[PDB]
Amino acid sequence: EFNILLATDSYKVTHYKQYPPNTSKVYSYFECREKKYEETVFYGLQYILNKYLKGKVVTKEKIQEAKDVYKEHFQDDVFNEKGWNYILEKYDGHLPIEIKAVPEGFVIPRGNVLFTVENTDPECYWLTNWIETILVQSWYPITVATNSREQKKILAKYLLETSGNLDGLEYKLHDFGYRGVSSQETAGIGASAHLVNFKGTDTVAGLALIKKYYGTKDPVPGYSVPAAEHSTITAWGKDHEKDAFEHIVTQFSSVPVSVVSDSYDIYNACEKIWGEDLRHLIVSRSTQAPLIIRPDSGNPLDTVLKVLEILGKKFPVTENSKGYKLLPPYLRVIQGDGVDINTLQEIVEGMKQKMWSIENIAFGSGGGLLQKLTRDLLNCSFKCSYVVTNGLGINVFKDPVADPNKRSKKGRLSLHRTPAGNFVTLEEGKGDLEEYGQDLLHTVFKNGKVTKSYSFDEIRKNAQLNIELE
Amino acid sequence: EFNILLATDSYKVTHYKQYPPNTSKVYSYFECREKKYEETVFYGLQYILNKYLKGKVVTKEKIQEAKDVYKEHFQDDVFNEKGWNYILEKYDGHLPIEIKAVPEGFVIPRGNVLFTVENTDPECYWLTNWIETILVQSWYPITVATNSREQKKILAKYLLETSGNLDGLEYKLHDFGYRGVSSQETAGIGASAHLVNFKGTDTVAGLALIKKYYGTKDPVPGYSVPAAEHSTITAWGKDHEKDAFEHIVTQFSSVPVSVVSDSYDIYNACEKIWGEDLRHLIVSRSTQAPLIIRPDSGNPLDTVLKVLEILGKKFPVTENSKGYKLLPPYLRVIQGDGVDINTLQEIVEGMKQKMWSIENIAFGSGGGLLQKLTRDLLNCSFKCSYVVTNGLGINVFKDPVADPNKRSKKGRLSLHRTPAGNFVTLEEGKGDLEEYGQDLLHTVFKNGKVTKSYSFDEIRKNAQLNIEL
Numbered sequence: 001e002f003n004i005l006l007a008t009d010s011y012k013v014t015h016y017k018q019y020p021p022n023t024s025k026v027y028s029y030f031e032c033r034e035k036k037y038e039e040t041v042f043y044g045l046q047y048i049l050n051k052y053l054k055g056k057v058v059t060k061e062k063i064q065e066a067k068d069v070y071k072e073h074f075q076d077d078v079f080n081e082k083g084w085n086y087i088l089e090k091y092d093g094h095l096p097i098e099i100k101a102v103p104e105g106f107v108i109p110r111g112n113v114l115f116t117v118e119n120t121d122p123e124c125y126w127l128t129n130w131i132e133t134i135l136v137q138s139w140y141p142i143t144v145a146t147n148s149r150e151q152k153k154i155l156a157k158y159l160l161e162t163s164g165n166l167d168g169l170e171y172k173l174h175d176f177g178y179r180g181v182s183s184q185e186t187a188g189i190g191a192s193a194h195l196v197n198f199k200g201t202d203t204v205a206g207l208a209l210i211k212k213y214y215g216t217k218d219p220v221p222g223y224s225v226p227a228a229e230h231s232t233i234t235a236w237g238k239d240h241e242k243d244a245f246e247h248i249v250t251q252f253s254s255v256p257v258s259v260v261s262d263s264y265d266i267y268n269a270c271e272k273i274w275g276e277d278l279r280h281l282i283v284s285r286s287t288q289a290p291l292i293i294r295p296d297s298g299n300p301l302d303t304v305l306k307v308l309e310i311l312g313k314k315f316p317v318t319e320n321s322k323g324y325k326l327l328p329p330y331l332r333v334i335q336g337d338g339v340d341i342n343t344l345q346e347i348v349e350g351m352k353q354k355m356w357s358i359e360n361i362a363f364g365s366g367g368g369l370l371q372k373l374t375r376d377l378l379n380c381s382f383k384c385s386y387v388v389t390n391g392l393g394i395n396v397f398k399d400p401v402a403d404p405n406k407r408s409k410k411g412r413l414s415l416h417r418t419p420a421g422n423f424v425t426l427e428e429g430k431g432d433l434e435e436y437g438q439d440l441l442h443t444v445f446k447n448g449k450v451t452k453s454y455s456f457d458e459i460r461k462n463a464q465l466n467i468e469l470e
Numbered sequence: 471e472f473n474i475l476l477a478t479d480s481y482k483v484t485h486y487k488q489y490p491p492n493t494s495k496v497y498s499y500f501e502c503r504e505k506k507y508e509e510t511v512f513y514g515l516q517y518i519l520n521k522y523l524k525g526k527v528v529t530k531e532k533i534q535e536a537k538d539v540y541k542e543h544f545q546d547d548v549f550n551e552k553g554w555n556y557i558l559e560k561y562d563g564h565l566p567i568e569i570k571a572v573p574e575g576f577v578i579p580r581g582n583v584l585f586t587v588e589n590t591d592p593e594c595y596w597l598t599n600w601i602e603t604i605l606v607q608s609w610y611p612i613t614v615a616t617n618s619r620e621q622k623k624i625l626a627k628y629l630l631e632t633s634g635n636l637d638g639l640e641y642k643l644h645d646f647g648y649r650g651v652s653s654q655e656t657a658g659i660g661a662s663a664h665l666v667n668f669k670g671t672d673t674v675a676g677l678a679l680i681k682k683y684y685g686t687k688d689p690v691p692g693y694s695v696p697a698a699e700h701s702t703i704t705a706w707g708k709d710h711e712k713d714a715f716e717h718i719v720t721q722f723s724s725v726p727v728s729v730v731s732d733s734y735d736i737y738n739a740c741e742k743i744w745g746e747d748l749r750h751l752i753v754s755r756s757t758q759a760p761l762i763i764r765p766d767s768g769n770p771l772d773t774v775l776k777v778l779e780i781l782g783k784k785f786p787v788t789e790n791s792k793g794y795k796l797l798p799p800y801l802r803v804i805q806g807d808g809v810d811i812n813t814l815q816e817i818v819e820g821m822k823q824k825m826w827s828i829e830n831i832a833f834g835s836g837g838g839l840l841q842k843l844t845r846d847l848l849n850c851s852f853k854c855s856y857v858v859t860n861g862l863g864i865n866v867f868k869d870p871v872a873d874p875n876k877r878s879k880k881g882r883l884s885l886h887r888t889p890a891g892n893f894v895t896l897e898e899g900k901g902d903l904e905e906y907g908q909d910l911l912h913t914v915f916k917n918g919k920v921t922k923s924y925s926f927d928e929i930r931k932n933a934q935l936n937i938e939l
């Protein structure tokens with residue numbers, strides 16, 4: 001049983017006493033602050049609104065629970081029981097909050113307003129920033145989606161250059177991150193964010209999240225293929241690696257199958273086992289059911305190049321119309337160890353220099369894709385920009401002397417199209433002057449209700465690469 | 471509804487068809503593989519056992535749900551319906567698995583077995599590694615607890631050197647990480663792991679997790695203090711920072727209060743606002759209710775030093791018995807921006823060089839504490855080491871030619887004390903020889919039941935520093 005009264009930074013419990021007396025409005029906004037990663041994919045707020053913020057989120061029992069916990073946590077009675085009771089009695093426990101946001105999947109340059117939050121009842125001035133902590137966690141799906149998309153750009157560039165098209169791009173980066181994230185909930189959120197850009201995942205948790213909170217026309221948003229792990233190879237015993245390989249490809253003879261080949265000696269496995277002993281079982285496979293050889297150790301670039309070199313001498317290689325080398329359609333490789341945005345770039349460039357097409361390879365990423373990310377990558381941040389005290393609106397901001405990068409925006413904000421079709425954020429309520437057309441933010445939450453939402457299909461469309469559109 | 475049949479890496483769905491025929495046993499183990507972080511705090515498994523693995527975790531509906539999902543996910547009917555129905559019918563949906571583990575809170579050197587997993591029914595040979603994915607997520611609380619403990623060692627060293635004792639050590643690193651982690655669940659898990667070592671947190675989610683899954687004799691495991699955020703200062707308007715400060719310290723006049731002081735000019739705030747305009751409201755405060763000044767920007771070391779330099783000119787400073795400078799007891803500082811294990815070390819060393827006692831300062835850490843950590847920090851890994859096929863036990867392992875660091879252990883494992891009091895993991899069932907005393911692994915889970923549990927108090931005792939001991 002989630003309790004929103006216990007889902008904030010502890011100090012926020014004490015803030016209702018700290019604002020100027022007679023403050024009736026607190027207005028705040030979220031941005032990926034300007035400071036690589038010049039544009040961000042806005043994704044994940046809809047999950048948060050539906051799972052945690054909407055409907056009756058306050059009850060008598062939840063208030064009492066919070067009261068009891070904070071009494072001990074602070075060793076003092078500081079909890080705003082009266083404020084929460086007001087929301088319970090007046091609004092049947094629905095949050096008197098209005099949130100405006102850019103559409104999910106939108107790709108927006110750094111330093112723009114992405115969403116705004118304000119209270120709709122003057123008694124609830126303190127509520128706007130109470131929910132900062134939970135809303136700021138949107139940094140995570142934003143960052144996964146953005147970093148995943150940047151990797152897609154790299155793959156698109158190199159696939160296009162070495163093959164002349166983008167066929168299969170959406171399957172070139174596979175999510176291996178389930179075991180490497182910090183929790184089950186994180187796994188679902190992170191996997192869903194990756195699926196904004198790609199269709200391949202082994203993080204099953206992502207599927208149910210998308211189905212529940214976003215929705216797709218297709219039965220599922222993401223797909224996988226049969227594959228071995230080291231245990232299904234090593235269990236056969238060291239002297240029987242060939243027997244394991246034979247059993248596995250025979251069990252999965254009519255569908256694609258990935259077989260990890262580095263349990264003892266990746267180079268021996270490729271040259272002698274796959275390349276000689278079991279070659280007859282590989283060359284007989286359909287192009288719809290390739291063997292995918294999976295190295296999993298050593299220097300990622302060096303290993304990929306040597307594996308390709310070996311396979312190229314054991315199997316018939318062709319030269320595509322761009323002049324790049326291509327394995328036969330029944331044989332592919334996946335590199336799924338040590339892949340992050342940096343090593344991904346290094347590998348595809350190294351392959352290009354050695355005249356190997358990117359068609360030959362797919363990538364798996366686990367820790368790099370879903371865990372090795374923090375809120376400071378895109379500087380995702382929530383700040384108060386406008387208050388009303390004694391009936392007077394005041395534009396407020398921080399501006400630390402030692403770090404101009406931490407300066408925050410002033411006043412009421414709105415997002416607009418510029419004459420050249422770019423994005424601009426207007427401060428100080430200047431959007432009201434109507435010199436930049438209509439505000440692009442939409443009301444997505446109001447008084448306990450979700451007022452606008454997006455399907456996962458819409459989100460994917462919004463997040464497309466320019467080259468995909470082109 | 472959580473569904474264990476949908477809580478694994480997709481490929482594991484296909485593994486029941488890949489093991490050698492006639493395999494009746496798959497036995498696997500978890501270690502923080504050897505390759506800085508020489509010892510790890512084992513913490514978090516009990517949460518996973520209770521929340522996800524115990525009791526009736528298989529139902530008719532869950533099997534059908536998984537069948538339907540995997541049919542579309544694989545575009546093929548590969549799911550092991552028979553195997554899961556067997557567990558449902560035979561064991562009322564309880565997992566026929568035995569897990570043995572080192573006690574939670576134990577501090578164990580890298581490269582040792584921390585827990586093992588095996589099937590208790592030959593039909594369920596495939597189940598051992600089905601649950602690898604969910605169990606391996608224990609890397610996270612282990613890593614948070616370990617990294618938090620390592621920072622405690624640094625703090626202990628410098629607090630001892632500059633003050634002669636360890637008073638208040640357990641409040642020197644405060645958890646600010648709630649907003650900076652990836653989910654609500656991660657927040658609770660991570661916060662609870664930090665509380666193995668310290669008592670200060672603003673990540674409230676940690677308290678509920680501890681109360682539900684571990685338990686403490688005290689009402690709560692962690693505590694906080696009133697504090698401002700930038701919004702409660704900036705809301706007063708730029709020209710009224712002083713009014714904000716005055717209002718806040720007066721509202722919280724008899725309890726500790728932290729006030730963020732860098733909204734516009736941290737140095738002006740310290741020298742002119744706190745140091746002159748409002749000095750009378752500070753020097754009158756109780757030692758049990760100090761003002762804690764919070765910088766939040768700039769180079770962390772340079773800023774801390776300059777803040778201390780400023781305050782030392784405006785407030786009466788003493789010299790402790792170790793020769794280090796000490797602010798009056800109604801005034802302290804917290805650095806809570808950009809703190810991680812590396813910068814923490816830099817700050818305390820810099821303070822020591824400038825003759826400032828660590829008594830003067832506490833640290834807050836958010837992203838560095840709970841989010842900027844990965845599974846490869848401690849190389850937390852789950853591997854199969856033993857199987858029985860055709861009634862014969864076989865010791866199995868991986869040993870990749872290009873990376874000896876990824877070699878895994880062979881056979882049945884056990885953990886023991888060495889004659890010198892250290893730890894050793896015995897391989898190949900050699901623990902059976904009884905030459906190394908009792909196995910330190912205890913059965914914690916068997917056939918759907920949690921069989922051994924630890925309180926959070928016990929875990930804290932196990933995880934104590936030597937210096938504390």
Ligand SMILES: O=C(Nc1ccc(S(=O)(=O)c2ccccc2)cc1)[C@H]1C[C@@H]1c1cccnc1
Pocket residue numbers: 171172173174175176177200202224225226227228229256258292294332333334336361362364479480481
């Ligand atoms: O290699 C694996 N899967 C896998 C392999 C290849 C691809 S692929 O090349 O994109 C692909 C996709 C669709 C059809 C054919 C090939 C997609 C997934 C799994 C063993 C690896 C894995 C899964 C989970 C966690 N860690 C590693």
Ligand SMILES: O=C(Nc1ccc(S(=O)(=O)c2ccccc2)cc1)[C@H]1C[C@@H]1c1cccnc1
Pocket residue numbers: 009010011641642643644645646647670672694695696697698699726728762764802803804806832833834
């Ligand atoms: O400074 C803050 N709290 C805080 C300040 C000082 C300490 S302390 O110095 O360890 C301490 C502990 C116990 C009693 C008295 C003082 C402990 C916590 C909160 C504003 C900062 C915060 C909280 C949450 C997220 N981000 C920043």
